[PDB]
Design a protein around this ligand. Structure first.
Ligand SMILES: NC(=O)C1=CN([C@@H]2O[C@H](COP(=O)(O)OP(=O)(O)OC[C@H]3O[C@@H](n4cnc5c(N)ncnc54)[C@H](OP(=O)(O)O)[C@@H]3O)[C@@H](O)[C@H]2O)C=CC1
Length: 295
C-alpha cells in the first residue's frame, strides 16, 4: 500500500511511518517544509492528491507546548491548523480521479466530558461542552467525506506515551530525577496509549477493510493519574512523591488546557477491540517498562 501522511514528520507520524514501512508499505508525508519523501501543503493545493491507496492526517499545532501562552492567537492556530489541513486533504480526496480506498484522522478523547463517575465508548455523546470537545467535533466534520468510495476512520486518541517525544518528552527527565508525582488530586482518569499501539491501530485501520467509523485510541486500562505516577516511578526506580497542585498547573498552562491535565475521562476502546486489533502494551506497567528500559 501507498500511504500519504499529513503531519507525518511528528511524534505519532514518525512511529507510524516506521511501522508502515516495516509492514511493506510506502509512505509520503505532507509537511510545511519541503524535502525528500514528502510534499508541501502548498503543493497539495496546487496540483492535487499524489497517487496513494490511503491517507492519514496528524497535522496540528502542538497544544501542550508550555512555551506558548493560551491566548486567542494560539487558540486560532490550534483550531485552524487542524481544520485547514484536514479540509485540504478531504477536498483533495473528493476531487482525486483515482481516490484512495481509506482515510483516517486522529483526534482526541477530549470529545468525552471529563468526569469522575462516567464511562465512555465510541458511541458516547460529547463534543459540545468546552473548547477541546468543540475542536474535535469541527475537526471530525472537516474530515467527513460524503459517499462511500473511501472508507473513513477516526481514531480518538488518549495520551500517547513513548520514547522520543510527546508528553514523555516533558515528563521523563523530571521523573528520572525524583521530581515526579501526581497532578492535582491524582484521582482523575488517565486515558493513555503506547505509541506502538496507536501506530498499530492506525495501521490496522489502513489495512483492514472492515474497519470504519470512530475508534478509541486508548489502552484497555483504568489507570488514574495517581496510578500513572506511581507505576512510572516504579519503572524508573525512583521516588515519585511530589504532587503538582492545581493552581500551579493552571498558572503554567491556563485554565482551559489545565483540564487536560487535572481532569479525565474513563474511555473504553470497545469498537477498537471489535476490529480484531490486539494490543502490544495493554497494561500500563508493561508500557512504561518498555519506555524506561530503552533510552
Ligand atoms: N498525546 C498525543 O500526542 C496526542 C496527539 N493527538 C493529535 O495527533 C496529531 C499528532 O500528534 P503528535 O505527533 O504528538 O504531534 P506533533 O506536534 O509531534 O506532530 C504534529 C505535526 O504536524 C505539523 N504541524 C505542527 N504545527 C503545525 C501547524 N501550525 N500547521 C500545520 N502543521 C503543523 C508538523 O509537521 P511539519 O513541521 O512537517 O509541518 C508536526 O510534525 C495532532 O493533531 C494532535 O492533536 C491526539 C491525541 C493525543
Amino acid at each position: 500500500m501507498r500511504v500519504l501522511v499529513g503531519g507525518g514528520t511528528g511524534f505519532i507520524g514518525t512511529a507510524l511511518t516506521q511501522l508502515l514501512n516495516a509492514r511493506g508499505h510506502e509512505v509520503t508525508l505532507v509537511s510545511r517544509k519541503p524535502g525528500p519523501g514528502r510534499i508541501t501543503w502548498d503543493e497539495l493545493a496546487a496540483s492535487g492528491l499524489p497517487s496513494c491507496d490511503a491517507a492519514v492526517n496528524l497535522a496540528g499545532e502542538n497544544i501542550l507546548n508550555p512555551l506558548r501562552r493560551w491566548n486567542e492567537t494560539f487558540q486560532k492556530e490550534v483550531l485552524g491548523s487542524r481544520l485547514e489541513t484536514t479540509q485540504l486533504l478531504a477536498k483533495a480526496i473528493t476531487k482525486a480521479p483515482q481516490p484512495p480506498k481509506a482515510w483516517v484522522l486522529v483526534t482526541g478523547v477530549a470529545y468525552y466530558q471529563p468526569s469522575l463517575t462516567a464511562e465512555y465508548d465510541e458511541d458516547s455523546p460529547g463534543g459540545d461542552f468546552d473548547f477541546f470537545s468543540n475542536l474535535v467535533t469541527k475537526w471530525e466534520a472537516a474530515a467527513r467525506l460524503p459517499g462511500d468510495s473511501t472508507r473513513q476512520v477516526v481514531v480518538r486518541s488518549g495520551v500517547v506515551l513513548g520514547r522520543g517525544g510527546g508528553a514523555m518528552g516533558h515528563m521523563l527527565l523530571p521523573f528520572r530525577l525524583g521530581l515526579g508525582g501526581p497532578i492535582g488530586s491524582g484521582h482523575q482518569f488517565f486515558p493513555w496509549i503506547h505509541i506502538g499501539d496507536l501506530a498499530g491501530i492506525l495501521t490496522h485501520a489502513l489495512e483492514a477493510n472492515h474497519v470504519h467509523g470512530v475508534l478509541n485510541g486508548v489502552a484497555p486500562s483504568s489507570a488514574t493519574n495517581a496510578e500513572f505516577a506511581q507505576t512510572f516511578g516504579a519503572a524508573l526506580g525512583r521516588r515519585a512523591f511530589i504532587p503538582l497542585p492545581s493552581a500551579v498547573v493552571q498558572a503554567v498552562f491556563g485554565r482551559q488546557r489545565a483540564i487536560m491535565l487535572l481532569e479525565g475521562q474513563k474511555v473504553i476502546p470497545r469498537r477498537t477491540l471489535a476490529t480484531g486489533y490486539q494490543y502490544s502494551f495493554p497494561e500500563l506497567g508493561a508500557a512504561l517498562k518498555e519506555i524506561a528500559e530503552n533510552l
